Amino acid sequence: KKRFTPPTYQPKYK
Amino acid sequence: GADRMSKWTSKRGPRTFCKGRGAKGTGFHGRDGKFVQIKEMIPELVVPELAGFKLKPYVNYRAPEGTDTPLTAKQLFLETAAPAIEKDFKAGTFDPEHLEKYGFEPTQEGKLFQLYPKNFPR
Amino acid sequence: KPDKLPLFKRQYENTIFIGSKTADPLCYGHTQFHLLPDKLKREKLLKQNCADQIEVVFRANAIASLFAWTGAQAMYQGFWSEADVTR
Amino acid sequence: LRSRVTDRYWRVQEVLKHARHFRGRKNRCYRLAVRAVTRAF
Amino acid sequence: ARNVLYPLYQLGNPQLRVFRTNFFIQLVRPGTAQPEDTVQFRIPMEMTRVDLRNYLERIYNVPVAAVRTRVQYGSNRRRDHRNIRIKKPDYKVAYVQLALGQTFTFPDLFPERKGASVDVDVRDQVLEDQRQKHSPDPRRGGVPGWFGL
Amino acid sequence: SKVTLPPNYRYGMSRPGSLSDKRKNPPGTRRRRVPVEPISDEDWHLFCGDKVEILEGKDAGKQGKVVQVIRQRNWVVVEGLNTHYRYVGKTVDYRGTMIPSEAPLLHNQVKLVDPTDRKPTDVEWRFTEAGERVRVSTRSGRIIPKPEFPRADGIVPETWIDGPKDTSVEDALEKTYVPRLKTLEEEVMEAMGIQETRRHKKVYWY
Amino acid sequence: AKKGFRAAYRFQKELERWRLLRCPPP
Amino acid sequence: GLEEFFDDPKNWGEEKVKSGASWTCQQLRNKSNEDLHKLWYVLLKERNMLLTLEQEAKRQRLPMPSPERLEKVVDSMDALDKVVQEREDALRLLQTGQEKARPGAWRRDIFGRIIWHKFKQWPIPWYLNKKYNRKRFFAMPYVERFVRMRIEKQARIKARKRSLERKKEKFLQEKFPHL
Amino acid sequence: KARGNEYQPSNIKRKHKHGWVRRLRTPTGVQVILRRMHKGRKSLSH
Amino acid sequence: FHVRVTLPPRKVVDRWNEKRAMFGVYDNIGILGNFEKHPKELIKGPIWLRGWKGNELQRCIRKKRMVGNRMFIDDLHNLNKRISYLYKHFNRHGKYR
RNA sequence: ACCAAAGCUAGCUCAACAUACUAAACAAAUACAAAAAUACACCAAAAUAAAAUAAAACAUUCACCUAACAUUAAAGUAUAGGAGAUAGAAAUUUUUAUCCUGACGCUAUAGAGAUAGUACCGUAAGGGAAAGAUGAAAGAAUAAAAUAAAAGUAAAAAAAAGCAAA
RNA sequence: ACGAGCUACCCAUGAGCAGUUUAAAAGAACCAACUCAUCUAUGUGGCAAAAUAGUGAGAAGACUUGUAGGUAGAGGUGAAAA
RNA sequence: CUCGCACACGCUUACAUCAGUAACUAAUAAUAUACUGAUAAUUAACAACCAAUAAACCAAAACAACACUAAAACGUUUAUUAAUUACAUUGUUAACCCAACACAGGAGUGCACCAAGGAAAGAUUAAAAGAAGUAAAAGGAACUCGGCAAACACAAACCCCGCCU
Ligand SMILES: [K+]
Ligand SMILES: [K+]
Ligand SMILES: [K+]
Ligand SMILES: [K+]
Ligand SMILES: [K+]
Ligand SMILES: [Mg+2]
Ligand SMILES: [Mg+2]
Ligand SMILES: [Mg+2]
Ligand SMILES: [Mg+2]
Ligand SMILES: [Mg+2]
Ligand SMILES: [Mg+2]
Ligand SMILES: [Mg+2]
Ligand SMILES: [Mg+2]
Ligand SMILES: [Mg+2]
Ligand SMILES: [Mg+2]
Ligand SMILES: [Mg+2]
Ligand SMILES: [Mg+2]
Ligand SMILES: [Mg+2]
Ligand SMILES: [Mg+2]
Ligand SMILES: [Mg+2]
Ligand SMILES: [Mg+2]
Ligand SMILES: [Mg+2]
Ligand SMILES: [Mg+2]
Ligand SMILES: [Mg+2]
Ligand SMILES: [Mg+2]
Ligand SMILES: [Mg+2]
Ligand SMILES: [Mg+2]
Ligand SMILES: [Mg+2]
Ligand SMILES: [Mg+2]
Ligand SMILES: [Mg+2]
Ligand SMILES: [Mg+2]
Ligand SMILES: [Mg+2]
Ligand SMILES: [Mg+2]
Ligand SMILES: [Mg+2]
Ligand SMILES: [Mg+2]
Ligand SMILES: [Mg+2]
Ligand SMILES: [Mg+2]
Ligand SMILES: [Mg+2]
Ligand SMILES: [Mg+2]
Ligand SMILES: [Mg+2]
Ligand SMILES: [Mg+2]
Ligand SMILES: [Mg+2]
Ligand SMILES: [Mg+2]
Ligand SMILES: [Mg+2]
Ligand SMILES: [Mg+2]
Ligand SMILES: [Mg+2]
Ligand SMILES: [Mg+2]
Ligand SMILES: [Mg+2]
Ligand SMILES: [Mg+2]
Ligand SMILES: [Mg+2]
Ligand SMILES: [Mg+2]
Ligand SMILES: [Mg+2]
């Protein structure tokens, strides 16, 4: 299948 | 996205959305779309004559204060209507049926300025 | 600034017109007739506490209207900013 | 009654005192020191 | 009046009268160039053109001619210490033009005093002299000068 | 104007709305809560302007006048007795005007001084037959009057001159009220001759 | 703040050792 | 008469300006209703001038001379409003006996709360109003669970507050064993 | 062909879909308001 | 593993306060009182735990029986989940079986 | 020698007692696109909870799982169950009042998520944090006291050969 | 429970297609705006969670496009690619 | 070297004046449309808001003369009513919006292609490898899965599968 793991974002407060 | 925690006013929406900022309407729309402004609905400010009036926005420091006694509905009655009722009762002229002579009014709609509906703004 | 007149800027087609296109052989004018609208009546000015404004409306209408007519006549004859006006 | 280890400073000092003369990161880091100290004995 | 309930109007109602107005007006210096007849006021949001015209003609007896008003938007960008927007209040600015040719110029409300300016200069001169006296002597080399010998 | 304060706050002999207080306490900080023994408003017998005696500190047995009281932390400030020295005028190339500053004292280190014997004495509030709350000493048994102190405004009503916008005392105390049964709306309308004929229609409220 | 007193006092034994090493007594 | 917005020219450059005390509540009860009407505008003209000076102070980046004058005037305005209102409600109680000058009744909104619904002025009755008939004053059965939950949330908040007061009393006694 | 910009702002659509009026017109919508009031949300709806 | 560098204020505990001196005074009320009150009638605490003992499962079940109708909504739901998990763990999991 | 280290309050948890249970604030505006004074209306509604699981599979069944009025016993008994898993009463019994309520509960990676459902990420339902430390006085900042102890660096780059040590 | 502000389709209401070739506004022809994305090379934590450069197909129609409304998961929608 | 002015939709003071930038923001410096503090501002004629009922009327927009097939948005007049009363309320800044970014991407209409708007190179040396562009002796597909790519070429014919857009 169309395997793809979307990236995550670091929280802005850091 | 958009800010959901701000004030929704007329400046944010499209041209169609035009919300007043709190003013009181003073008319309506006529036949041709020209705004017909009713003279009565305009608040006519009433001012007295202060030329011959001697009073100032400040009071002298040496003027003594007084015991803070809020006006009471009972104290007002004992000051205005009680002397009239007391004299009439002693003279035998008191009429429990009609109290209009002492300032009591049965229905408020007759007078120009109601009290319970609070007709006058200020 | 002219914005205190008040005057408001706008953008649309720039047109130079005389009442007819250039092909019309009648390229000059004789007189103009103007009728003041309802908002500029004498009675309206008195209510708004405007006495000297009665003559201002007449003067403002004539100066702006006649200049546009006379200016358009000159530019239909070819006269413009760099050619000035001969007659 | 939450019980926490407070003398952990002396827990690692009993190990590092035998690893003061090593070369590299084995003389500072505890995890690398224990494997070196155990092999030393 | 603001924060009050006006009476609903139908046909034949009596004239609406307000005796103690709740409105307050600030006279401000224009930030840009204005003509000779224009006076700039700051008015509360609940005030209309007709209210301001009656406000000046009756309370202050100022023969105004035309009144124009606009709504100003305050800054809502700066963040608090806890990263929360703090919004300045929005104020309504109204311009009026006098009728009988009366001319108004905004006066200078803070004229300096020649004596006060002289006194400030003397105080500054005294402080400068005191600093010079307190300045250490370079030839002493940092040795304290309080002791005699 | 009243300035709101955080639920936990520290007082340091500076008013909350001062620039010195903001410099000491930025709005984004909060510190440890000091233990303050609760004293009810009816148990605080120390005011400003009465002579008191200092028990503990570098100076003991001396007497002085109370100038400032911190009710929040139960502090009494004597006038230049428990003093430490600081500098006021500071700039790049000059320093000076060495001004002594008085440190705060707690209530337990300060005891009120009776006027007659000039010695410390415990004070208890007593209700006399005149209906006035007057402090009463324990040892001597003599009452102590309240320490009348000038207000923070610094203006004495005894010596005052009326300005252009100051109302005279006679006009301030002049009474012109006639208590009739007409509102302010009715009286002013009939006073100026304002005449209205028509009446409002029926309005439905819901 | 861990509850206890043995840990607090046993370190005072170490602080004295460091002071002697840094500034030996005459 | 446009100079009324500014103080007299002799006082423009003064760094400190003295003023008298504000009107107290008791002093205004001795004045007549006609007298209070005239005094309101005397205060009104004073307050406009102070606001103009205060704004001009920010423009010139200079402190406002004796800013406490504005605080005194606004206090006088509030006292004048209070005493006249003290005459309106007292007169209303004698004539009608209603506590509040705006009609209203307690209603239960869709959210289950109890809300004091003020009335509004309309030229048509309640049943002939399109907008009014769309508002709902009653709680649906599903609101019962959510109304119950709000009680639990408020109960825990008060329960935490009460236990906090007890802890402080014990803590202060240990550090102040004067008993 | 370049996703990521699926949100095209519009005040007419936002106030018609997530507005306060729509939340009070359906029985399920009112429960959404009740949940947010109980949770203590600063903004119940757009 | 950093430890505090200052000696804490030593706790001056008095062994002879009112609580410790009078601790466990009437533990023998039944023995020396004509057996009029069992010592279990002196326990102060929860309603469902006065003179009772059990493991974690029997305690949660007992709490639901007595004061179940007086608990809050959120507390009632959390108790039900705890009962179900303990019921499954005690019976369907373990080593000795 | 830098980076760092240390502190004990904020408040919380579990009960008990308990009034009897949607707080505080409501001047004006709030279900037109909420917080916009003002026009001929429509208004409203209910239908058993299901399944993840257990029976080492899974179809009948599977405690608690919305509505019990409790405790000591009868009793895990009678019964109900692909009679398997497991489910499970009653008749009949026991229960003396008020005070004695506080803590072998935590102390900033703990305790509520909370300084807070706020920042911030989502169109929306929803998800949801980190963050505090001087002293009696900082109206003692040429200000003061304290550990100078984590990894990482500096003071002080390296000299044949080797699980780095013995 | 919440989602058709991207996308599939539809209902409203609007707005675009210049020149050139032909009795043609003919799902004709050449070629822009405009819309799709054939081939190759760069790019592969990149400018970009699908792009840039060159080259290509349609370009008066079964065409592109703005605003706004409708269909919701046992379903919606589909000139079937599950 | 050339995507420029304006409106709608959106964003919400990020715009303007003055001062400061050791540090925060710009992926650097100068510095200030973008960071900090104070003060100030968008003024209506344009735009939003801006009557109801009954009756007569089969006859398209495409320069519309007159016609085609797919049969087409676009109203006047008569009658009965409509508060009649200067000045109502509201949108007017910007170097901007949606894409985690001050992103070589996405973005509707009118008018121009400029009179307007902008800067490919921070300073050097001129190695390999890699990317993009120009030119070439003799030969012209001998390359290679294929003439892919490139070219001073820009043509002709056959077959298979689908009719065609
Ligand atoms: K088991
Ligand atoms: K939709
Ligand atoms: K890009
Ligand atoms: K913006
Ligand atoms: K081949
Ligand atoms: Mg958001
Ligand atoms: Mg708008
Ligand atoms: Mg706009
Ligand atoms: Mg008009
Ligand atoms: Mg305007
Ligand atoms: Mg997204
Ligand atoms: Mg779109
Ligand atoms: Mg199974
Ligand atoms: Mg298993
Ligand atoms: Mg089940
Ligand atoms: Mg059977
Ligand atoms: Mg925490
Ligand atoms: Mg911890
Ligand atoms: Mg270290
Ligand atoms: Mg070797
Ligand atoms: Mg759509
Ligand atoms: Mg064409
Ligand atoms: Mg074609
Ligand atoms: Mg496609
Ligand atoms: Mg391309
Ligand atoms: Mg290319
Ligand atoms: Mg090429
Ligand atoms: Mg083509
Ligand atoms: Mg073709
Ligand atoms: Mg839906
Ligand atoms: Mg399907
Ligand atoms: Mg399709
Ligand atoms: Mg297929
Ligand atoms: Mg398939
Ligand atoms: Mg943004
Ligand atoms: Mg730059
Ligand atoms: Mg500058
Ligand atoms: Mg700025
Ligand atoms: Mg980038
Ligand atoms: Mg460059
Ligand atoms: Mg370079
Ligand atoms: Mg090369
Ligand atoms: Mg090459
Ligand atoms: Mg070539
Ligand atoms: Mg060649
Ligand atoms: Mg070959
Ligand atoms: Mg070959
Ligand atoms: Mg091939
Ligand atoms: Mg090719
Ligand atoms: Mg073949
Ligand atoms: Mg085909
Ligand atoms: Mg064929």
Report DSSP letters for J35-69, one per residue: T-S-GGGG--S-GGGTT----HHHHHHHHHHHHGG
In order of E117, F54, J26, J31, J87, the CA distances from J52 in angstroms are: 90, 61, 19, 20, 20
Interchain proximity F166–B112, CB inside 8 Å: no
In order of E23, E73, F82, H49, the CA distances from E93 in angstroms are: 14, 11, 57, 17
Q: Minimal CA–CA distance to E77: which of E66, E67, E85? A: E85
Q: Which two tokens stand for residue E93?
A: 């600015």
Report chain breaks in chain H, C–N > 2.5 Å, as residues after which they occur.
none
CA of G22 to C1' of K146 (A): 17
Asked if residues F174 and H30 have their Cβ atoms less than 8 Å apart, the reply is yes
Count of the separate structural domains present in chain E: 1
Instruction: Residue E100: list chain C partners with CB under 8 A.
Output: 51
Q: Which two tokens stand for residue H4?
A: 């009324």
Longest dimension (CA), chain H: 73
Asked if residues E101 and E45 have their Cβ atoms less than 8 Å apart, the reply is no
Q: Which two tokens stand for residue H61?
A: 């980046």
Name the resolution in angstroms: 3.6
Contacts of D4 (CB under 8 A, 6+ apart): G2
DSSP SS3 for F25: coil
Proximity of residue A11 CB to strand L below 7 A? no
DSSP string, chain H: -GGGGS--GGGSS-S-----BPPPHHHHHTS-HHHHHHHHHHHHHHHHHHHHHHHHHHHTT-PPSSTHHHHHHHHHHHHHHHHHHHHHHHHHHHHT--S-SS-EEEEE-TTS-EEEEE--EESS-GGG-HHHHHS--S--TTHHHHHHHHHHHHHHHHHHHHHHHHHHHHHHHHH----
Count of CB atoms situated within 10 Å of the CB of E64? 23
Distance D25 CA to ligand 20 centre (A): 20
**J4 to chain D: nearest residue by CA?**
D6
Per-residue b or e along F150-167, where b marks 16 or more CB atoms closer than 10 Å to that residue's CB: eeeeeeeeeebebeebbb
Asked if residues D22 and D36 have their Cβ atoms less than 8 Å apart, the reply is yes
Sheet strands side by side (includes E92-98): E26-27, E38-43, E92-98, E64-71
Structural domain boundaries enclosing E29: 1-149
Report residue H38: phi and psi, to 5°: -70, -35
Longest dimension (CA), chain J: 60
In order of B101, B117, C13, F86, J72, the CA distances from F83 in angstroms are: 75, 66, 83, 10, 59
> What is the number of helices (H) and of strands (E) in chain I?
3, 0
Asked if residues E7 and E13 have their Cβ atoms less than 8 Å apart, the reply is yes
Count of all residues that appear for chain F in the document:
206
- The domain that contains E123 carries what CATH number? 3.30.70.330
Chains F and H touch (3+ CB pairs under 8 A): yes
Q: Which two tokens stand for residue E144?
A: 């304290």
How far, rounded to the nearest angstrom, does the alpha carbon of residue H32 sit from its chain's CA centroid?
25
Question: Cα–Cα distance between E25 and E67 in angstroms, integer?
Answer: 14
Contacts of H54 (CB under 8 A, 6+ apart): H64, H67, H70
Q: Minimal CA–CA distance to H104: which of E5, F115, C41, F119? A: E5
- Under DSSP, the state recorded for F49 is S
Residue whose structure tokens are 């709504």? E71
Q: Minimal CA–CA distance to B22: which of E95, E51, E76? A: E51
Distance from CA of J3 to the nearest CA of D (A): 7
The sign one gets for the Cα dihedral E104, E110, E116, E118 is negative
In degrees, rounded to 5, the angle at the alpha carbon of residue H43 between the alpha carbons of residues B76 and H87 is 15
In degrees, rounded to 5, the angle at the alpha carbon of residue B45 between the alpha carbons of residues C54 and E30 is 60
Written as one letter, the residue type at I19 is G
Q: Which two tokens stand for residue F101?
A: 């500053």
Q: Which two tokens stand for residue B72?
A: 């009471």
Contacts of J73 (CB under 8 A, 6+ apart): H145, H148, H149, H152
Annotated binding site of B for Mg(2+): 13-14
DSSP SS3 for D12: helix
Question: Cα–Cα distance between B34 and B28 in angstroms, integer?
Answer: 9
Proximity of residue I41 CB to strand L below 7 A? no
Q: Minimal CA–CA distance to E106: which of E57, E39, E43, E61? A: E39
In order of B26, E122, H54, H61, the CA distances from H13 in angstroms are: 43, 20, 14, 15
**H or E element, residue F24:** helix F19-24
Q: Minimal CA–CA distance to F66: which of F47, F87, F92, F85? A: F47
Q: Minimal CA–CA distance to F73: which of F119, F115, F41, F104? A: F104
DSSP string, chain E: --SS-PPPP-TTPPPPEESS-----EE---SS---TTEEEEEE-TT--HHHHHHIIIIII---EEEEEEEE-------B-TTS-B--PPP-EEEEEEESS--------S-PPPHHHHHHHHHHHHHHHHHHHHHSPPGGGTT--SSS--
Q: Which two tokens stand for residue H114?
A: 């109890």
Q: Left if phi > 0, otherwise alpha if psi is -120 to 50, otherwise beta: which for J35? A: left
Torsion of CA F168, F169, F171, F172, to 10 degrees: 110
Distance C36 CA to ligand 10 centre (A): 24
Which ligand number lies closest to the CA of residue E77? Answer: 4
DSSP SS3 for B120: coil
Q: Minimal CA–CA distance to E13: which of H115, H44, C76, F196? A: F196
Report residue F125: phi and psi, to 5°: -70, 135
Q: Left if phi > 0, otherwise alpha if psi is -120 to 50, otherwise beta: which for B54? A: beta
Distance C46 CA to ligand 27 centre (A): 79
**Per-residue three-class SS string for F74-137:** CEEEECCCCEEEECCCECCCCECCCEEEECCEEHHHEEEECCCCCCECCEEEEECCCCCEEEEE
Q: Which two tokens stand for residue H137?
A: 């004053």
The sign one gets for the Cα dihedral F61, F66, F68, F73 is positive
Count of all residues that appear for chain A in the document:
14
Question: Cα–Cα distance between E80 and E86 in angstroms, integer?
Answer: 7
* Strand bridging mode B35-37 / F133-137: unpaired
Q: Which two tokens stand for residue B38?
A: 């009713």
Question: Cα–Cα distance between E123 and E131 in angstroms, integer?
Answer: 12
Q: Which two tokens stand for residue F144?
A: 């102590």
Check if H110 contacts I (Cβ < 8 Å): yes
In degrees, rounded to 5, the angle at the alpha carbon of residue G11 between the alpha carbons of residues G9 and G17 is 120
Proximity of residue D23 CB to strand K below 7 A? yes
How far, rounded to the nearest angstrom, does the alpha carbon of residue I29 sit from its chain's CA centroid?
9
In degrees, rounded to 5, the angle at the alpha carbon of residue J25 between the alpha carbons of residues J23 and J26 is 135
- Under DSSP, the state recorded for B51 is T
Q: Minimal CA–CA distance to J14: which of H174, B47, B88? A: H174
Question: Cα–Cα distance between B56 and B23 in angstroms, integer?
Answer: 32
Annotated binding site of B: 13-14
DSSP SS3 for F69: strand
Report residue E60: phi and psi, to 5°: -105, -10
Longest dimension (CA), chain C: 48
Asked if residues F181 and B81 have their Cβ atoms less than 8 Å apart, the reply is yes
Asked if residues H72 and B81 have their Cβ atoms less than 8 Å apart, the reply is no
Count Cα atoms within 13 angstroms, Cβ side, for E117.
Answer: 5
Per-residue b or e along J53-65, where b marks 16 or more CB atoms closer than 10 Å to that residue's CB: eeeebebbbbbbe
Torsion of CA B4, B6, B12, B14, to 10 degrees: 30
Asked if residues B103 and B80 have their Cβ atoms less than 8 Å apart, the reply is yes
Written as one letter, the residue type at B60 is N
Q: Minimal CA–CA distance to B114: which of F185, F206, H84? A: F185
Q: Minimal CA–CA distance to I26: which of F107, F129, H140? A: H140
Contacts of F26 (CB under 8 A, 6+ apart): E81
Q: Which two tokens stand for residue H72?
A: 């005194």
Contacts of J49 (CB under 8 A, 6+ apart): J43, J59
Report chain breaks in chain E, C–N > 2.5 Å, as residues after which they occur.
none
Q: Rounded to the nearest 10 degrees, what angle do helices H143-175 and I27-39 cross at?
A: 0
Which residues are paired to F64 by β-bridges?
F52
> What is the number of helices (H) and of strands (E) in chain A?
0, 0
Q: Minimal CA–CA distance to E45: which of F48, F77, B22? A: B22
DSSP string, chain C: -GGGS------------SSS-TT-S------------GGG-HHHHHHTT-STHHHHHHHHHHHHHHHHHHHHHHHHTT--TTT----
- Under DSSP, the state recorded for I20 is H
Asked if residues E53 and B37 have their Cβ atoms less than 8 Å apart, the reply is no
Instruction: Give the right CATH number for I1-46 from 3.30.70.100, 1.50.10.10, 3.40.50.2000, 1.10.287.3980.
Output: 1.10.287.3980
Asked if residues J51 and J62 have their Cβ atoms less than 8 Å apart, the reply is no
DSSP SS3 for I3: coil
DSSP SS3 for B59: strand
The sign one gets for the Cα dihedral H61, H67, H71, H73 is negative
Torsion of CA I8, I11, I13, I18, to 10 degrees: 110
The sign one gets for the Cα dihedral F178, F181, F185, F186 is negative
In degrees, rounded to 5, the angle at the alpha carbon of residue H9 between the alpha carbons of residues H3 and H10 is 150
Count of CB atoms situated within 10 Å of the CB of F128? 10
Q: Minimal CA–CA distance to F80: which of F67, F61, F93? A: F67
Q: Minimal CA–CA distance to F47: which of F146, F140, F131, F153? A: F146
**H12 to chain E: nearest residue by CA?**
E109
> What is the number of helices (H) and of strands (E) in chain G?
1, 0
Q: Left if phi > 0, otherwise alpha if psi is -120 to 50, otherwise beta: which for C78? A: left
Question: Cα–Cα distance between I26 and H81 in angstroms, integer?
Answer: 45
Bases in strand L with any atom closer than 7 Å to a protein CB: 1-6, 37, 48-51, 67-69
Sheet strands side by side (includes F123-127): F123-127, F133-137, F143-144
Written as one letter, the residue type at B65 is E
- Under DSSP, the state recorded for D25 is G
Question: Cα–Cα distance between H95 and B108 in angstroms, integer?
Answer: 9
Contacts of E17 (CB under 8 A, 6+ apart): B43, B44, B46, B120, F189, F194
Q: Which two tokens stand for residue E56?
A: 């000046």
* Strand bridging mode E38-43 / E92-98: antiparallel
How far, rounded to the nearest angstrom, does the alpha carbon of residue H11 sit from its chain's CA centroid?
34
- Under DSSP, the state recorded for J10 is P
Asked if residues J47 and J67 have their Cβ atoms less than 8 Å apart, the reply is yes
Chains C and G touch (3+ CB pairs under 8 A): no
Distance B18 CA to ligand 21 centre (A): 26
Residue whose structure tokens are 């001697």? B54
